[PDB]
Assembly symmetry: C6
């Protein structure tokens, strides 16, 4: 109810984001797409499993 509109706003607005993983790695890029279980983060797109994500941090505020 909140997750989907937040991720969709980031995707639609092409906002650069930081995705912090539970193991301490920081990914950065734009959300190309997402589904129930994964986020596709744009050299290639990488498929990130949500279960591995701790936080998604927009580079700037977004309407949601």
């Amino acid at each position: 109810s909140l997750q989907d509109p937040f991720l969709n706003a980031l995707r639609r607005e092409r906002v650069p984001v930081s995705i912090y993983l539970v193991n301490g790695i920081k990914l950065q890029g734009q959300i190309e797409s997402f589904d129930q279980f994964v986020i596709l983060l744009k050299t290639v797109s990488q498929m990130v499993y949500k279960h591995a994500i701790s936080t998604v941090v927009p580079s700037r505020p977004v309407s949601h």
Copy 2:
């Protein structure tokens, strides 16, 4: 049955909280919103997956 009224009390009362992640990071801010799987924590709001959270600690006691 307990989680939702606790989080809602924190959100409604705008109580500063600490969210401790399973990987040892401490986040701090106010709960803007939450749903089944995520908490939105207010420079930007960040989307925190519950699966990554160990504990939510209010800065002061809250009615719940």
Copy 3:
């Protein structure tokens, strides 16, 4: 079938407990309440996600 009566006994008897988290932290306090996914542990009550808990250890034996 076992979890609920065990936690309820600890709550009802107000037994001090240690809650060990998967990341190695030890929490201590009394169980105020619990639900499907969280335990509320009593300066403030903190909301502990069960997914982050490894073991719940009573400070003394309890009827269950």
Copy 4:
């Protein structure tokens, strides 16, 4: 289909076991009881969440 008869054999036969947790801790004792999500391991009984367990190792072979 395998988990329940294995755990029940350990419980019924009162076999000492080692329960290794995902965080590297080793617990030892006898299985008093178990349910869908937890194992009760016998100074006090401690409630171990299965999600925190990596392996259950009997101290000797058991019929199962």
Copy 5:
């Protein structure tokens, strides 16, 4: 909705991939097959549980 066509594209196109695990290990190979819970990664094929995967990174862009 996104995961399955992405993995299927990698499998069909036999694209070398890197599979990063939550514990920091990097696996490399070609996706032979996958199902709801596992990916088979091609000396032998190894069965990788999705719950252990953080990211799947194609070695080159793929139609999806």
Copy 6:
């Protein structure tokens, strides 16, 4: 759809396997049996929770 025939092939053929856990431990033995949630790995058989497994690696290729 893939996991069950792979594990069954390993079990039926009694192929030595390595089971790598998410915490970095390596287990070795033969799969005696498995179910939805656990694998029984043959001094004693140990019960390994799948949630703790990262990869299952056959010692030699197997029909599947």
